[PDB]
Design a protein around this ligand. Structure first.
Ligand SMILES: Nc1ncnc2c1ncn2[C@@H]1O[C@H](COP(=O)(O)OP(=O)(O)O)[C@@H](O)[C@H]1O
Ligand SMILES: Nc1ncnc2c1ncn2[C@@H]1O[C@H](COP(=O)(O)OP(=O)(O)O)[C@@H](O)[C@H]1O
Ligand SMILES: Nc1ncnc2c1ncn2[C@@H]1O[C@H](COP(=O)(O)OP(=O)(O)O)[C@@H](O)[C@H]1O
Ligand SMILES: C[S@](=O)(CC[C@H](N)C(=O)O)=NP(=O)(O)O
Ligand SMILES: C[S@](=O)(CC[C@H](N)C(=O)O)=NP(=O)(O)O
Ligand SMILES: C[S@](=O)(CC[C@H](N)C(=O)O)=NP(=O)(O)O
Lengths: 442, 442, 442
């Protein structure tokens, strides 16, 4: 743990002229408040209020006042605000003025369900994500447009890769913030890039994910580009999906490692699988909270459409990397980077360890092309489709209780009313698709 | 009736020059062909054949060849500027290479189910439809714009209803084609138009419907405006429905008319409703065979939203016009003018005739305005909500096996497939609404 | 030879910041992935993998996860990567996750055929390339226009060769990267360029080739010019193909130099050419693997048109440069820079190592201008005619089962699929040519 006092003098060895307290709203969006180095004790002693009412996902305007308490380990300095004022960073948890924490804080609802594996013995919850992102050219307005940075491809090179000089500026801006970056490259769709790093403690891997998305964006609008974490911005091309590499640690040993099994996977991992897969239909409404996230979960674009799993195969809902070692992990790939990392982790922790506790037995590893299977030749194998509309997936989540009770009373009730009414805008609205399709033939 | 010896007489009488053989495809699309008056006798020998694989939903390409047998009762000369190109049409029944009526021919389907009221004792099946349509301007190159001629409202007056020479010229041309016209006016939303005509038996009111769209499609395009029967071409204004006013007749009798029961309504009628009411869930993919009509089917714009009935009231599924007697009608507002009036009539007959052989005890009249209740108030009565989408409205249909038997087994087999892919063709696509709300946001 | 101890040294000596792991897909398309020096150990431990399903022609999606084993004798720093993000490269080999190598990987297909020359006693199957490219200007939005920056001819000078300082800044950039470069000059057709570099043993020239292209694409786009290797980009002017200057060696002695035989040429030398002459029809699908290069193979433009050889003459399929000694070389000419430098060598090795176990008494020099002979004489001497299209070269390929074996089999069946697709995706399409010559005509 970082100290409170040596943080006060952390600003004098680097003359930090501002600190940015930052937390996260219900929809995954990073809100912020900036304060000078002048107010540093006023925040470290937890006396910084705000207006709760206007942050979508919090209390009503009657009980508006809400305080902010910093997590003194999430101290980095913003490397690009040299020369103006060296700007630090600190992540906060949201507290009601009763000094009772807020059960609607997205970072509390993981800070609590990470203690249920405490009651049953595991060291850590290791998340290494793969947040994929597209990049679009800007204009004279510097207001983004739907023309991608290159008509490139998977692993292709300059001249065909025009973010080669951009990703590289993004990775060295992230590494200056104390990361360990695995690789950098261009994904299979045009303008689609992927920067993956090394796994971390569940919450400090989640904190690190809200870091990444802010660096990828500010350092692109510095390259003439704009970075989108929208899952399916085009038709008929790979979507951007934030893979979920999960692995529990236990006393300096990967909980998933069976040293001399055939699939070298402990029967902990095997009842971990049946956890999410049983519950897959419920919780994905959370892990893909935008209507468009389903417009991406279609057959053919390396995205999963059916609830299943296999080994080193990129069709199913979960993939097992053929390399395990101490990096042994199972790859839930039905996560896209519009969900809340704090909330996808909490949900999938619960309904995931619910499979070892209940000891659920795991279904068949479907080792072929899941997209190449008849409507009725996969219906004999029991595997069935992931829900197609947000209305459908919200019904099958609200139905589910095991994940509904790790979503908090205040978050779920504040969530489905936001996802439904977001979806009614859709169902009521007519798009220019429908004009094209009908207006002249009828 | 009309003998073959009339048609020749009328040709050499009215001096027609070319003959058209119209029929209607699976989706509602009147498709015809031209022959000289030198062919007049050959078509009446019913020895004139077209490409069967080439009209949607009819047949496959290995049994392409299919015959056209005209209906001499339909003869009407086309009255536009054709002195030398004077026309004459005849709506065709479709037959096989073995002369048996074609299962797919929807003109056959209507008549087929019509013989199911010849055994419940009813002379006719009258239908007075209200096909409401929109008027759009045309560009310099005669392509449909997205502006509408005027910005008037219900019943408005010149100079704020541009289509007042338009409908004038629409109505007159119809009055030449054997029509008797009731009225011509402006509807709720701007550039919308209602033209009404006296009821007729189905296979002749619907022939007065397929004739209607054409002679508004063309006469409106003679005033330089393209006309649509798209349900809701603009979000936030009344989708144009095509109200379905019907009546069964009994030895010169309006079989819904007995001036005693609760409203001066009969029992063959009070029973009819419970058939619709019960089977209404399962016939909305036929009354509304398009993704877009489910966008008129949000409430507030005088369209049906839930499955209940009332009097004098334009909010429910079925309104009953106060005027009664011969004017005693059952008004069904769920149909919109994209639908197939040979499949729509065929189906509702087998919904409501399933309510004279059981009569199924109709539910309560909600004389409120049903748009103004709550999810706890709909459930208080227990009123069925019309389905969500072309998605549900497709599964809700392959349940009602009395309705499936109103389309036939080869018309339903070529109507689920043609909507399934058309439904899938929208489910997968990404339309601009998805990028506005998310691209610059996530 | 270089050791993994040497590369831990240079990264801290050069102070490089990223390592790029590179390979080639089936089509000659370079695909590489960038990683920090912070992961220099994981690749030298071979513990870095990728997605095989996305490398065009590597594998199919069910068994994707595949390893990356790096080659150290391939290490070079990039020189254009300032002191801010300096870059070191390493060409790799592909290993299936079970640590067995990949039969579809082209680099090891060569290694296996270069072992077929250890059974015949040959230290080196040396190769010198002549990749010829075009230069197209760049528009305002960095898009390669249809203008050639210069309108010159052979060996011309400033000011009638724009890319004079271009071919300078490439050479230096090549010269920083351990290259030995012969000659930098303007080629025949306008806006054409050649850069000759001295030979190296096959797998290291194939490295030096795919590398050399990357250095001209990226440098040419510094001066803002698209660098392309399309064989016949313009019709009616010289095609830019990649000559193949090959020579065998045994104990520091060229195996083709014996100043007794008629042309100062050896026996294995003369014998080699029969191994190509007959087999030439077969591999002309691997040396010209594109629709476009079969318009280059036409007569007139100093490119092989029929299968023939001769001395100091630049019409035939094989040229033999007058200069002999250690520069005693055989010049194959069908190849275009769109061919796979790994496939071509293992093809031509097994092709021309077939003329040393069989040797087929190679035919005699038609040292005429074979560009100027009518059909009455081409089948007089019996000179085989080259295939006329991709689709012809393919059927001509699946018969010489030794070239087929030269390719392995995975590469082969992965090859016939896509080119038959490519050949068929061009057989069926319609291009504005046929629209001029027939539309207003017929
Ligand atoms: N034991 C583990 N638990 C969780 N995540 C891991 C583990 N080992 C590796 N990872 C993560 O897997 C990710 C690999 O990224 P990438 O190479 O894009 O995956 P893929 O092989 O699916 O393409 C990294 O983010 C890394 O942190
Ligand atoms: N007895 C009847 N049976 C069936 N349809 C009828 C009957 N009387 C009138 N109609 C139809 O009602 C239509 C007129 O409807 P409209 O004036 O729009 O009434 P509303 O405004 O109540 O819908 C006419 O087209 C006519 O054919
Ligand atoms: N003995 C040899 N073995 C292999 N390659 C050779 C030999 N001699 C020359 N080369 C190659 O020939 C190339 C020079 O080609 P170039 O100068 O264009 O000759 P030409 O103009 O006759 O084609 C060099 O790239 C070199 O690698
Ligand atoms: C090549 S991809 O394999 C693409 C997967 C897809 N874009 C998605 O996850 O949505 N995934 P990864 O980065 O793990 O290799
Ligand atoms: C009030 S309206 O009823 C307009 C109908 C509405 N736009 C609909 O068809 O959904 N039609 P009409 O007055 O002729 O009965
Ligand atoms: C006689 S030329 O040979 C002209 C090149 C020709 N257009 C070709 O197809 O290679 N080239 P080079 O002198 O490099 O051998």
């Amino acid at each position: 743990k970082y100290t409170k006092e040596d943080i006060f003098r952390f600003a004098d060895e680097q003359n930090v002229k501002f600190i940015r307290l930052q937390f996260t709203d219900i929809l995954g969006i990073i809100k912020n408040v900036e304060i000078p180095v002048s107010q540093l004790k006023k925040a470290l002693d937890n006396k910084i209020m705000f207006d709760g009412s206007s942050i979508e996902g919090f209390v009503r305007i009657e009980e508006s006042d809400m305080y902010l308490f910093p997590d003194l380990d999430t101290w980095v300095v913003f490397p690009w605000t040299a020369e103006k004022g060296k700007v630090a960073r600190m992540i906060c948890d949201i507290y009601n003025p009763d000094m009772t924490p807020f059960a609607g804080d997205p970072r509390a609802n993981l800070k609590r369900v990470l203690k249920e594996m405490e009651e049953l013995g595991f060291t850590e919850f290791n998340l290494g994500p793969e947040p994929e992102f597209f990049l679009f050219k800007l204009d004279e307005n510097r207001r983004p447009t739907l023309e991608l940075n290159d008509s490139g491809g998977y692993f292709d090179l300059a001249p065909t890769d025009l973010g080669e000089n951009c990703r590289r500026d993004i990775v060295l801006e992230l590494e200056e913030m104390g990361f360990e970056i695995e690789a950098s490259h261009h994904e299979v769709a045009p303008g689609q890039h992927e920067i993956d790093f090394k796994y971390e403690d569940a919450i400090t891997a989640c904190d690190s994910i809200q870091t990444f998305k802010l660096v990828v964006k500010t350092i692109a609008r510095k390259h003439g580009l704009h970075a989108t974490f929208m899952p399916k911005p085009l038709f008929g091309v790979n979507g951007s999906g934030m893979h979920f590499n999960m692995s529990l640690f236990n006393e300096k040993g990967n909980a998933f490692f069976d040293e001399s099994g055939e699939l070298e996977l402990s029967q902990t991992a095997y009842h971990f699988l049946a956890g999410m897969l049983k519950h897959a239909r419920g919780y994905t409404a959370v892990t893909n909270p935008t209507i468009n996230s389903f417009k991406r979960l279609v057959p053919g674009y390396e995205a999963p459409c059916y609830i299943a799993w296999s080994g080193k195969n990129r069709s199913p809902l979960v993939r097992v990397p053929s390399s395990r070692g101490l990096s042994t992990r199972l790859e839930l790939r039905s996560v896209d980077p519009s969900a809340n990392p704090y909330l996808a982790m909490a949900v999938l922790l619960k309904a995931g360890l619910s499979g070892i506790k209940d000891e659920l037995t795991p279904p068949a590893p479907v080792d072929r092309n899941i997209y190449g299977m008849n409507e009725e030749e996969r219906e004999a194998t029991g595997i069935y489709d992931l829900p197609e509309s947000l209305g459908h997936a919200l019904i099958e989540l609200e139905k589910n209780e095991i994940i509904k009770d790790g979503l908090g009373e205040h978050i779920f009730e504040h969530f489905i009313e936001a996802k439904t009414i977001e979806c009614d805008m859709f169902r009521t609205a007519v798009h220019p698709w429908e004009r094209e399709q009908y207006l002249e033939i009828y």
